[PDB]
mmCIF file of C-alpha atoms in Angstrom:
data_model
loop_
_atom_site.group_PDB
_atom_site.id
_atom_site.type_symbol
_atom_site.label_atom_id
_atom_site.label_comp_id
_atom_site.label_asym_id
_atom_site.label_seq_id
_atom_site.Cartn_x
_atom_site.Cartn_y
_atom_site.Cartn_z
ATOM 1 C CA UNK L 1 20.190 -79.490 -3.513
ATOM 2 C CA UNK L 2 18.524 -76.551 -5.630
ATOM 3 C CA UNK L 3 20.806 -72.934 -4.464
ATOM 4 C CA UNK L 4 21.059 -69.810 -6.408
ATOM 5 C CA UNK L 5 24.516 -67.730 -5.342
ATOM 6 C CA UNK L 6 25.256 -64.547 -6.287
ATOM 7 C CA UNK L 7 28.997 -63.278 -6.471
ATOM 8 C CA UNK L 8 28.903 -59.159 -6.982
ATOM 9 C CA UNK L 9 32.271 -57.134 -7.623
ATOM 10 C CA UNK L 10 30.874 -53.450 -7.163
ATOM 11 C CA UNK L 11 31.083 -50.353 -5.539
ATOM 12 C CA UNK L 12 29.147 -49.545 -2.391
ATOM 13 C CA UNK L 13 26.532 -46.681 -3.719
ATOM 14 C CA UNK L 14 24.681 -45.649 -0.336
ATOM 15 C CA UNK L 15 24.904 -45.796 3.147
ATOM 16 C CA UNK L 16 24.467 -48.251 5.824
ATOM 17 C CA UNK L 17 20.793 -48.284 6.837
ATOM 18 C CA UNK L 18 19.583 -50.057 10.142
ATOM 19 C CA UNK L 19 16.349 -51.706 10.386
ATOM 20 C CA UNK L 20 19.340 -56.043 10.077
ATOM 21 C CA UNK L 21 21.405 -54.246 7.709
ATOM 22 C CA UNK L 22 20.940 -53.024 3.801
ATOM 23 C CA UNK L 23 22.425 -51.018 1.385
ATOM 24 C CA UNK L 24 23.557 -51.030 -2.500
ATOM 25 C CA UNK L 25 25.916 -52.049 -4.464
ATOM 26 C CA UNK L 26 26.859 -50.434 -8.082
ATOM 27 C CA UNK L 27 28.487 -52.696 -10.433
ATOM 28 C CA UNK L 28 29.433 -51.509 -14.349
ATOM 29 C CA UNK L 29 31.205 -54.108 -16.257
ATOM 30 C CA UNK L 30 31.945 -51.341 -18.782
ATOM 31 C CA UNK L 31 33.500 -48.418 -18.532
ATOM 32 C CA UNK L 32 30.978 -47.340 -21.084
ATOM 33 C CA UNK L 33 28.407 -49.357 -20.635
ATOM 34 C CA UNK L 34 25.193 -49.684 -17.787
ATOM 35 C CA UNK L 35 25.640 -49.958 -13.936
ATOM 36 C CA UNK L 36 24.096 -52.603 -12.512
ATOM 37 C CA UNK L 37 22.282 -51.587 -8.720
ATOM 38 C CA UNK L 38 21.906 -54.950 -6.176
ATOM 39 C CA UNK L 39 20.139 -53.990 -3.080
ATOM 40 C CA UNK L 40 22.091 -56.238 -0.608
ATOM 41 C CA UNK L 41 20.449 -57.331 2.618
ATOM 42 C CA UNK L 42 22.870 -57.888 5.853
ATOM 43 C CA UNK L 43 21.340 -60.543 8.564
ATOM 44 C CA UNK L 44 24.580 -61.932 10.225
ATOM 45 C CA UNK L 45 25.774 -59.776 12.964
ATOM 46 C CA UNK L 46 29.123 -60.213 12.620
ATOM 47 C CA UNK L 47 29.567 -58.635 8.751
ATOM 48 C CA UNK L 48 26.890 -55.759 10.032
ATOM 49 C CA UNK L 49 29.758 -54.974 12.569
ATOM 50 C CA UNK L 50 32.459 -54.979 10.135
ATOM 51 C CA UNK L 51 30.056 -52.729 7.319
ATOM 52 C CA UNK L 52 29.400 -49.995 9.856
ATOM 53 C CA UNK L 53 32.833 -49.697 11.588
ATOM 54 C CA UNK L 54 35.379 -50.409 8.704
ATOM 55 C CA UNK L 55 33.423 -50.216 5.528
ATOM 56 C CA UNK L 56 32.763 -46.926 3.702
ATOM 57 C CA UNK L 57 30.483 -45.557 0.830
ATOM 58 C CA UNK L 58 32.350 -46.049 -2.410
ATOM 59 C CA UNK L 59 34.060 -48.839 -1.003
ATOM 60 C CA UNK L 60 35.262 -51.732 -3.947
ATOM 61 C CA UNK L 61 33.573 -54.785 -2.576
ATOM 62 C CA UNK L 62 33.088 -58.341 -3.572
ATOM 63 C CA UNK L 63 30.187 -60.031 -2.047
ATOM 64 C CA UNK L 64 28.882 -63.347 -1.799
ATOM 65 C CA UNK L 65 25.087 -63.126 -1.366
ATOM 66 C CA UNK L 66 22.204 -66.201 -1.697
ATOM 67 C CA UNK L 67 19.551 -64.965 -4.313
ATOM 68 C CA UNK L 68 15.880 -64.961 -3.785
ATOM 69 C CA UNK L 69 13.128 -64.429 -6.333
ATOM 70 C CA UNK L 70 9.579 -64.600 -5.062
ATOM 71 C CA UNK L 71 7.259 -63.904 -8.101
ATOM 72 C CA UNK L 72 3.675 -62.895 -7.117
ATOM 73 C CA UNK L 73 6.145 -59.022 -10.188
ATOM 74 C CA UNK L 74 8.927 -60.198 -8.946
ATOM 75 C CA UNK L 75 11.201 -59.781 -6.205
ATOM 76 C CA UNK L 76 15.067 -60.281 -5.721
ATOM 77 C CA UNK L 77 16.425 -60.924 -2.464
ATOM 78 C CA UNK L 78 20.011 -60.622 -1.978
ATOM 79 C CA UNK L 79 21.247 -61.644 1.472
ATOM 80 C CA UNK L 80 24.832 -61.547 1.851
ATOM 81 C CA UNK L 81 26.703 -64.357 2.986
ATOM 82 C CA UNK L 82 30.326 -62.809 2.448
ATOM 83 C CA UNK L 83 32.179 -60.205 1.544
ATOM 84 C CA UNK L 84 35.531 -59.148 1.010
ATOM 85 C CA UNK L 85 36.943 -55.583 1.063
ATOM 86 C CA UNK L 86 39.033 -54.665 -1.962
ATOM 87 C CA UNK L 87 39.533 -51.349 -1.724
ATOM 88 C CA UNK L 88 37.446 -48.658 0.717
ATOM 89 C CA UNK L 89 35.899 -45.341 0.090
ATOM 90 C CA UNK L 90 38.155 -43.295 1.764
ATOM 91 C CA UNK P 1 36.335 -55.682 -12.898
ATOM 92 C CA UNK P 2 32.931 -55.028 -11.966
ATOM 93 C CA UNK P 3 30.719 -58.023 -12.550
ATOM 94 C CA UNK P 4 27.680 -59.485 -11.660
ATOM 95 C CA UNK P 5 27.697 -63.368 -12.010
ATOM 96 C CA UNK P 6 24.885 -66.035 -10.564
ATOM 97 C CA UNK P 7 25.274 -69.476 -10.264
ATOM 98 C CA UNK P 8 21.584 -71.489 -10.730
ATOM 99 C CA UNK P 9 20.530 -75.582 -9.789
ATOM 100 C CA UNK P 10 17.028 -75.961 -10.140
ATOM 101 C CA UNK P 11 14.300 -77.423 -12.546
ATOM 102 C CA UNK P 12 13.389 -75.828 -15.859
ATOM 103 C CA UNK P 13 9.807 -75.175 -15.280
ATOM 104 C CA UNK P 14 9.009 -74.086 -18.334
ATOM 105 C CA UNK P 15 8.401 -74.835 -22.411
ATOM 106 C CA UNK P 16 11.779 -73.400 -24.752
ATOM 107 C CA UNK P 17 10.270 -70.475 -26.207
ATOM 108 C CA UNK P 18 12.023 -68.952 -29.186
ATOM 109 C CA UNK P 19 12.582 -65.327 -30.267
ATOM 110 C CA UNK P 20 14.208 -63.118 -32.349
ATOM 111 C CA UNK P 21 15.634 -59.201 -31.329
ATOM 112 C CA UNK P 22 15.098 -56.137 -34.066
ATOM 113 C CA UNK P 23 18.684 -57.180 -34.421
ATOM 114 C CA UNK P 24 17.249 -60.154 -35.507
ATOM 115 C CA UNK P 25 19.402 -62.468 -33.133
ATOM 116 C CA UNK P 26 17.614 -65.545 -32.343
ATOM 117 C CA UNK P 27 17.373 -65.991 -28.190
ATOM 118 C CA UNK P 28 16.073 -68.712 -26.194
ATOM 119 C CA UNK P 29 14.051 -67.531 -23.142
ATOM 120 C CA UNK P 30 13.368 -70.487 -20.390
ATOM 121 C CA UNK P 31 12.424 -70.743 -16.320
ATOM 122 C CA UNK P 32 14.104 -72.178 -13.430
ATOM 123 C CA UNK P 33 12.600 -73.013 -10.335
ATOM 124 C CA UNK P 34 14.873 -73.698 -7.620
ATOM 125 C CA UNK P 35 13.718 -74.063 -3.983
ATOM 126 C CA UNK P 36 16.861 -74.765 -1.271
ATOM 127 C CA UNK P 37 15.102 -75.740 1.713
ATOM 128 C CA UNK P 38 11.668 -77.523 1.789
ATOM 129 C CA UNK P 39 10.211 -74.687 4.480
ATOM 130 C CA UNK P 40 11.493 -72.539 2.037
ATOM 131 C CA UNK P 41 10.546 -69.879 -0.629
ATOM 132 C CA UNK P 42 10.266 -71.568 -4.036
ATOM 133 C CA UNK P 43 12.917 -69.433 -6.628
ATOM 134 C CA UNK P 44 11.690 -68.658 -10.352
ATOM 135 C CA UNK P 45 14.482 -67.632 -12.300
ATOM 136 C CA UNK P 46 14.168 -66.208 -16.335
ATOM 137 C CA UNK P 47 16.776 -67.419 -18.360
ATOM 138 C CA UNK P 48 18.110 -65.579 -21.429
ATOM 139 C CA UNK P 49 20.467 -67.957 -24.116
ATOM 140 C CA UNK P 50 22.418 -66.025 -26.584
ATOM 141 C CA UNK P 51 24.959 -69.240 -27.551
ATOM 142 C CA UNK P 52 23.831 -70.007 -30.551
ATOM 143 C CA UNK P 53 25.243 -73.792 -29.588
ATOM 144 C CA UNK P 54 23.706 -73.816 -26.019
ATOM 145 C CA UNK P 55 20.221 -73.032 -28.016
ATOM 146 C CA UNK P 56 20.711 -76.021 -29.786
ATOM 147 C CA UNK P 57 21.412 -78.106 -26.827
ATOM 148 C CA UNK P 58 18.886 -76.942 -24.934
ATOM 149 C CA UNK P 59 15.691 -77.572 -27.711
ATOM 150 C CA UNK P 60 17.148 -80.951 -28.978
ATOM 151 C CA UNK P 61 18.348 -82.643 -25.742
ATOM 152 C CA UNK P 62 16.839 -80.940 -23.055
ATOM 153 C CA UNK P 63 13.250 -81.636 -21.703
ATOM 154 C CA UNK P 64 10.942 -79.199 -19.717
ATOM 155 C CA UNK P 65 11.639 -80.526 -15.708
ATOM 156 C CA UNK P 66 15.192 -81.322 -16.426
ATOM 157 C CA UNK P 67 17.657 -80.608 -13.596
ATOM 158 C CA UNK P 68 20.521 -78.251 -14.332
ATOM 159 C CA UNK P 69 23.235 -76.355 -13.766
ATOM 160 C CA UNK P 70 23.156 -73.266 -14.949
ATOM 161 C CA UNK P 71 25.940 -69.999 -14.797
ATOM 162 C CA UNK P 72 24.606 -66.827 -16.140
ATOM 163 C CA UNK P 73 26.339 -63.211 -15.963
ATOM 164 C CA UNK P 74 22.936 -60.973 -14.212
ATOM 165 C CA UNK P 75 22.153 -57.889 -15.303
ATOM 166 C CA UNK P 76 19.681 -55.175 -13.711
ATOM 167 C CA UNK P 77 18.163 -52.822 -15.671
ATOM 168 C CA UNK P 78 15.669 -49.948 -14.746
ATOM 169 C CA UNK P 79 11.014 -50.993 -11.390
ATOM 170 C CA UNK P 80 14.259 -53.426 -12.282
ATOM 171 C CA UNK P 81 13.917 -55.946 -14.404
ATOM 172 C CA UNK P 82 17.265 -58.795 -13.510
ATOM 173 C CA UNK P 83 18.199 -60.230 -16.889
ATOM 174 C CA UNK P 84 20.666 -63.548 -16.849
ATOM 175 C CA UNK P 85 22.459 -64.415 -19.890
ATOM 176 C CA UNK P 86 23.249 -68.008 -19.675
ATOM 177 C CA UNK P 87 26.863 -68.452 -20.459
ATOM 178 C CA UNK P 88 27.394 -71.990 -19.365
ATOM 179 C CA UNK P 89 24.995 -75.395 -18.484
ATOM 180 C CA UNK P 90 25.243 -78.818 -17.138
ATOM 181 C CA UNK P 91 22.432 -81.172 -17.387
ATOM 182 C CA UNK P 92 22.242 -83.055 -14.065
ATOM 183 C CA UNK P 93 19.080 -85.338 -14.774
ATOM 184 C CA UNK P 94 17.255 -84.596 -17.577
ATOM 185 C CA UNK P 95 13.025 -84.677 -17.542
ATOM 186 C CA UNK P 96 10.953 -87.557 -18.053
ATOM 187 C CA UNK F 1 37.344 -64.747 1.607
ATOM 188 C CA UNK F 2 39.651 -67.132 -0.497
ATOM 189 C CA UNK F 3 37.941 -70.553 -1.587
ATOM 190 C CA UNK F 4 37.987 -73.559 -3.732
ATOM 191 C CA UNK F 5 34.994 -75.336 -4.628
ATOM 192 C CA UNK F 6 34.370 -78.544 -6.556
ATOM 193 C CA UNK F 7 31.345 -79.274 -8.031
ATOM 194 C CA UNK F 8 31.201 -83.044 -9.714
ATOM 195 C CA UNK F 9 28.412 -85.378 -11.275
ATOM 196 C CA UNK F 10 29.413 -88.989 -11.418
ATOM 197 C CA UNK F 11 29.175 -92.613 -10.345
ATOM 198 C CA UNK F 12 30.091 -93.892 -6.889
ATOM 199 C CA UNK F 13 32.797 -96.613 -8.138
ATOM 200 C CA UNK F 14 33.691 -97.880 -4.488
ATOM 201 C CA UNK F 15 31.670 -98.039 -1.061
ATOM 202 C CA UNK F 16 31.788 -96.326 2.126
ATOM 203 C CA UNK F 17 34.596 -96.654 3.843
ATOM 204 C CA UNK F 18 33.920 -95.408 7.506
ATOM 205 C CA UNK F 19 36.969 -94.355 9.628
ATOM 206 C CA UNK F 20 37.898 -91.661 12.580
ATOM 207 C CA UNK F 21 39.358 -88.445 13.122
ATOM 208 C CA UNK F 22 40.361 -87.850 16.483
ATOM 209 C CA UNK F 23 34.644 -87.561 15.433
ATOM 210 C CA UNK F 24 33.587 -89.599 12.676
ATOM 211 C CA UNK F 25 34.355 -89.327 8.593
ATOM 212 C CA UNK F 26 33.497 -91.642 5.599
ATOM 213 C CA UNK F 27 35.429 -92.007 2.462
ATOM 214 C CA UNK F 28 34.406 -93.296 -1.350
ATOM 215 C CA UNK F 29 35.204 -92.239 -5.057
ATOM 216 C CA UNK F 30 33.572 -90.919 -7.785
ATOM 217 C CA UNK F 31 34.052 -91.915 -11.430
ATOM 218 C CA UNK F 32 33.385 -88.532 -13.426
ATOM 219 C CA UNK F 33 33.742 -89.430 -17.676
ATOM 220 C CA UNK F 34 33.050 -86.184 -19.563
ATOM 221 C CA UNK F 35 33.148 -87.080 -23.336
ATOM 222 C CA UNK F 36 36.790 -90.605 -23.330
ATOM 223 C CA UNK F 37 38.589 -89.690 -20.656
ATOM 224 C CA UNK F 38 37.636 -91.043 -17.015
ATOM 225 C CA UNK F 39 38.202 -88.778 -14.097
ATOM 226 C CA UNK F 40 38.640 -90.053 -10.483
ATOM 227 C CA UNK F 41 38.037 -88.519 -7.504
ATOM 228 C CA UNK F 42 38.849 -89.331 -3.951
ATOM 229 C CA UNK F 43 35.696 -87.825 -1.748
ATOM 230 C CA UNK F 44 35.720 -87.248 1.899
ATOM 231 C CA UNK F 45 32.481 -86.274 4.024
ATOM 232 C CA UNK F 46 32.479 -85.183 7.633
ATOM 233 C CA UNK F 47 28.697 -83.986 7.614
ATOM 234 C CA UNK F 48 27.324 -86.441 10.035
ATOM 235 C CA UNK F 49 23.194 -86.173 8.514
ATOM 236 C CA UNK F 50 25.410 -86.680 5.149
ATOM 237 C CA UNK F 51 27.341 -89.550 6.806
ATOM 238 C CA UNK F 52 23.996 -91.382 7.257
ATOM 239 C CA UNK F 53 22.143 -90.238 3.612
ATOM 240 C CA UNK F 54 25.115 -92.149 1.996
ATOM 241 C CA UNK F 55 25.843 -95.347 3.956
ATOM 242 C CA UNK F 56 21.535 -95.965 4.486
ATOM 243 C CA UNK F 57 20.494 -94.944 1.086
ATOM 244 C CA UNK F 58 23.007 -94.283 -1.521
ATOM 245 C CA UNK F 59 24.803 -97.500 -3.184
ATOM 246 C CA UNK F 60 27.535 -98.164 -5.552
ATOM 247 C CA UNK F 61 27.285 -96.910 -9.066
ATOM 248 C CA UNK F 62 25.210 -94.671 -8.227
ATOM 249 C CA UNK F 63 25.228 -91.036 -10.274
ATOM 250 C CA UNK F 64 25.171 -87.932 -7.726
ATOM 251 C CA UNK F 65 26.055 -84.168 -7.866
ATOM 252 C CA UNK F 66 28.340 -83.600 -5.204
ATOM 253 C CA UNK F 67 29.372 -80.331 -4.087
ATOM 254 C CA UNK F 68 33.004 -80.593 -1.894
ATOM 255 C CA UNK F 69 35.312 -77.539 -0.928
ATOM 256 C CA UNK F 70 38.907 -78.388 -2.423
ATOM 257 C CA UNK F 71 41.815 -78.314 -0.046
ATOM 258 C CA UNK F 72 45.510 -79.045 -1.394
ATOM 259 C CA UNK F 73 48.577 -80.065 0.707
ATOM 260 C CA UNK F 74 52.178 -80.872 -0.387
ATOM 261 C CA UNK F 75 54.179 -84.112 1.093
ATOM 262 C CA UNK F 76 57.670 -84.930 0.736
ATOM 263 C CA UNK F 77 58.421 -88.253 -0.949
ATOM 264 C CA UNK F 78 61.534 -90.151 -0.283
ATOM 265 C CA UNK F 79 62.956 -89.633 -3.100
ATOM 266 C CA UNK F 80 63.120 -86.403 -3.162
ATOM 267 C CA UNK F 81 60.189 -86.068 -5.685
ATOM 268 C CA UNK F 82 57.390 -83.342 -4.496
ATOM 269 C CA UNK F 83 53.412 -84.677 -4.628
ATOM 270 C CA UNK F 84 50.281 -83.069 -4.293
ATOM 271 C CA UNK F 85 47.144 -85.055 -2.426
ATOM 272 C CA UNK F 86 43.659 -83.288 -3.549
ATOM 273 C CA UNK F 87 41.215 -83.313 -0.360
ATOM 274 C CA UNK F 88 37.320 -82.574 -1.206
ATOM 275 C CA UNK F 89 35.412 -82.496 1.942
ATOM 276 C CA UNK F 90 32.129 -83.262 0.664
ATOM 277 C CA UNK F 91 29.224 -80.262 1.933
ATOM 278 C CA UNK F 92 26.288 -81.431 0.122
ATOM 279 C CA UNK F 93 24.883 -84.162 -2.270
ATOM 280 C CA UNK F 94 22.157 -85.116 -4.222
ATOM 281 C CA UNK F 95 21.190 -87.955 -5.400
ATOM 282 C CA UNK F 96 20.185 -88.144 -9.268
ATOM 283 C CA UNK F 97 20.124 -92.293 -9.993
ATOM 284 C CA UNK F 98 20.827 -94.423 -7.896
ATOM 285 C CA UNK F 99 22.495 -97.784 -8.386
ATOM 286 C CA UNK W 1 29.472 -85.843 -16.272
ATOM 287 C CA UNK W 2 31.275 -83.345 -15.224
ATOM 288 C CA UNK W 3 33.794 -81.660 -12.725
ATOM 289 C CA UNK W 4 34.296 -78.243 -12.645
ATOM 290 C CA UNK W 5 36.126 -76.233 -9.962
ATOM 291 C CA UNK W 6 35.465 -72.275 -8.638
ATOM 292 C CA UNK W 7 39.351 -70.485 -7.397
ATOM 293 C CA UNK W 8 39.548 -66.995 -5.968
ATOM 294 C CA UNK W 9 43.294 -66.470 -5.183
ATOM 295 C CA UNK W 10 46.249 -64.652 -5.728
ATOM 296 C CA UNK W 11 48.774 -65.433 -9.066
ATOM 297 C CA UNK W 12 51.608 -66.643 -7.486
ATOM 298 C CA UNK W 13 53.516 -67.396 -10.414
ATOM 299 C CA UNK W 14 54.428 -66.070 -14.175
ATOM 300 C CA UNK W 15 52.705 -66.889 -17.406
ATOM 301 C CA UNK W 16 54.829 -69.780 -18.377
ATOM 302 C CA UNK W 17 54.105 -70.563 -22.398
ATOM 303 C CA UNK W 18 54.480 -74.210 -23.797
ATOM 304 C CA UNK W 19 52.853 -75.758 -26.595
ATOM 305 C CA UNK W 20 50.122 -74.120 -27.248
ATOM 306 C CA UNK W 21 48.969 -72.780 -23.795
ATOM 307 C CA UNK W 22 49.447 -70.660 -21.012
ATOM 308 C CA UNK W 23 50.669 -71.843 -17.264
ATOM 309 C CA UNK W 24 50.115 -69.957 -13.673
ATOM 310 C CA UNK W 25 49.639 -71.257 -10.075
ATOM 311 C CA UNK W 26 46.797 -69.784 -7.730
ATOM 312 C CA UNK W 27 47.552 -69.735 -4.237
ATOM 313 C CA UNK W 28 43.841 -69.869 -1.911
ATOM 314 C CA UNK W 29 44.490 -69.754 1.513
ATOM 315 C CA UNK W 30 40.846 -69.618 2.894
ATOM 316 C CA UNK W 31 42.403 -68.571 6.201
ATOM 317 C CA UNK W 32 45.336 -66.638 7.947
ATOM 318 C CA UNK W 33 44.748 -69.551 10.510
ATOM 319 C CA UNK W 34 44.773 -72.329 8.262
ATOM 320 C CA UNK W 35 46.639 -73.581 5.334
ATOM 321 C CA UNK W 36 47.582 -71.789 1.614
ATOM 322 C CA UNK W 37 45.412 -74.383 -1.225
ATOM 323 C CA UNK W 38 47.717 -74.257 -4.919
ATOM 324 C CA UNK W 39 46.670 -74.916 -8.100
ATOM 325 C CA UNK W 40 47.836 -74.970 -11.312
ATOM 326 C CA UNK W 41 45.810 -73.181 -13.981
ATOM 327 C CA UNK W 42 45.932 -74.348 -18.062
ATOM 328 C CA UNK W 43 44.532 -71.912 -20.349
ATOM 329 C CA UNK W 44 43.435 -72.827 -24.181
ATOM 330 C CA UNK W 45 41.567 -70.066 -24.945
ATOM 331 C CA UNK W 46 43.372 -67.566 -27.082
ATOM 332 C CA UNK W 47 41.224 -64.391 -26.109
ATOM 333 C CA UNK W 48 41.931 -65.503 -22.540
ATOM 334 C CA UNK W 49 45.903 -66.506 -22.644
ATOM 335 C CA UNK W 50 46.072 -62.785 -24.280
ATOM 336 C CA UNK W 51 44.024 -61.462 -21.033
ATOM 337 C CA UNK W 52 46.349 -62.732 -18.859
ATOM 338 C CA UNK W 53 49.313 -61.813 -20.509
ATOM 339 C CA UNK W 54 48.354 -57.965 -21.611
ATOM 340 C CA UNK W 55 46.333 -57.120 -17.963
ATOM 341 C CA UNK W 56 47.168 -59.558 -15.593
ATOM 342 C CA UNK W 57 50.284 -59.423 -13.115
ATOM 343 C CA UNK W 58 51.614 -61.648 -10.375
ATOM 344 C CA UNK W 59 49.755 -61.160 -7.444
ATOM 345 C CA UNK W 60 46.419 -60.359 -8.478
ATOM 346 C CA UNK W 61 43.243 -61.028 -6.868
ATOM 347 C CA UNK W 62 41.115 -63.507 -9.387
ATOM 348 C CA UNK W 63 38.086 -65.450 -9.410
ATOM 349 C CA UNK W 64 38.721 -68.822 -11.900
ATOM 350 C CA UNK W 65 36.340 -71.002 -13.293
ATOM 351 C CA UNK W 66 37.603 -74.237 -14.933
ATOM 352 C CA UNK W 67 37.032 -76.995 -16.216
ATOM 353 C CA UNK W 68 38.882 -79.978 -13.533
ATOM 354 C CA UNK W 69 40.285 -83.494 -14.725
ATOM 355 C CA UNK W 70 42.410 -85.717 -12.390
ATOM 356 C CA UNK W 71 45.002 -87.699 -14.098
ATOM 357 C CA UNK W 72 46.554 -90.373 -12.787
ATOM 358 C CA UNK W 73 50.692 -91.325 -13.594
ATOM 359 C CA UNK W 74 52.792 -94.506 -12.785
ATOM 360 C CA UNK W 75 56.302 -93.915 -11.442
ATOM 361 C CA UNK W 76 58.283 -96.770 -8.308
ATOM 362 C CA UNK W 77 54.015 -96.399 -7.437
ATOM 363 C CA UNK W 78 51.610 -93.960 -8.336
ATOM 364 C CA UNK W 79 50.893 -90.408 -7.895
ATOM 365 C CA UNK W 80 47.928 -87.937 -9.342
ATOM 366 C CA UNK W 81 48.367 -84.626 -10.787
ATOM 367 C CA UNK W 82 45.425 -82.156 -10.876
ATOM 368 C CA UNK W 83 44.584 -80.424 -14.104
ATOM 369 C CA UNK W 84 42.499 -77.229 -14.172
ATOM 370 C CA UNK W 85 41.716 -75.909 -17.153
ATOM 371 C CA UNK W 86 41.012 -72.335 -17.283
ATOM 372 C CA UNK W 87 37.534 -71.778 -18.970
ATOM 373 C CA UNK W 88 36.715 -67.858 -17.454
ATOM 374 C CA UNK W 89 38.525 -65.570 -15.106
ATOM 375 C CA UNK W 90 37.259 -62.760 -13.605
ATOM 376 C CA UNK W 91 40.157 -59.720 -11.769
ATOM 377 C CA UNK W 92 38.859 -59.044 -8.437
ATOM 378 C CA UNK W 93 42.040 -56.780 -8.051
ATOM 379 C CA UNK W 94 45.328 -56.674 -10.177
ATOM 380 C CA UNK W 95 48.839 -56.675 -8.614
ATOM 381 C CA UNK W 96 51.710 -54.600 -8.559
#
């Protein structure tokens, strides 16, 4: 049973783009330190619902998303499974 | 607050390869392949150890194929290249 | 967004146990020894293609890697003491040696 | 072997000392619908026990990792008591 979760705790650093739904997600550890950008793909409709009608930019997030990595380069795929909203973007 | 962590079960498909930073810190850099669902896409994952005692369980017990659990904290850094630092490992089965 | 999850390698030390819900669950136990101590742990699995992997395939003393969300619930005992029963509702399973 | 257990919940509880380690409940209660899952956390680790006790308050929002053994006690019958020991915690969102 091979899986490969992802559990973010970031701030929501751009808008909610239609295509399913994507955006991305800034998280820094350190106050000092790097910030770490997650592009975050959306498929299930309910959570696209609750992104675009409740869920701001700069909103405190933390997400539950199953990783892909296809290597051909490689590419992360990050499609979130859950998330909960801590605190929004006003 | 902000973190970043990834839980990993898959096979190492790959040989222990050793390094050493211009810190000179000693690293062990591995490969996990983990594939959920057979009509699936087949994961490769780079592994980064920086426990000095998880290095030395993973070159004296631990053979290439091995199934394991691995928890690493992921970093992205800017292309982006995802690092994860393996901060914790369970062997399942090990390789033959 | 709240959860518990269990994750546990170890040796089937019992067999399946079918019963009912009121749909159809099976029960067994898993001896887990890390290091020495012996850990045992009641698991419960309602995933009917799950349900079938075990009873067909799977046999006692057998070492899996269980995955099972944790539920706790509180009962009353007579006399007056408070107890805690651990549920794990097994979600998926694999199978490293069997027995 | 192994059995390790993933909480996200709220501190319901103080940081009870005894000797020496630290003591706290989690409350998870996956739904509004359904029921509220407790759990009582042990924490070893000295830079931890001073994490809790310097950042943490009751009611914050935390994701533990740790380390779960089952022990058994004769009473009258038997019973089982849960332990979890803490091994990382991560604060989704501290309380007031």
């Amino acid at each position: 049973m091979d899986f490969s979760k992802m559990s973010i705790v970031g701030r929501i650093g751009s808008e909610f783009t239609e295509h399913y739904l994507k955006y991305s997600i800034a998280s820094q550890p350190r106050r000092d330190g790097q910030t770490n950008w997650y592009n975050i793909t959306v498929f299930n409709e309910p959570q696209i619902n609750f992104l675009t009608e409740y869920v701001r930019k700069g909103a405190l997030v933390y997400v539950e998303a199953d990783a892909a990595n296809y290597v051909f380069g490689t590419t992360l795929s990050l499609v979130q499974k859950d998330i909960n909203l801590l605190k929004n973007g006003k």
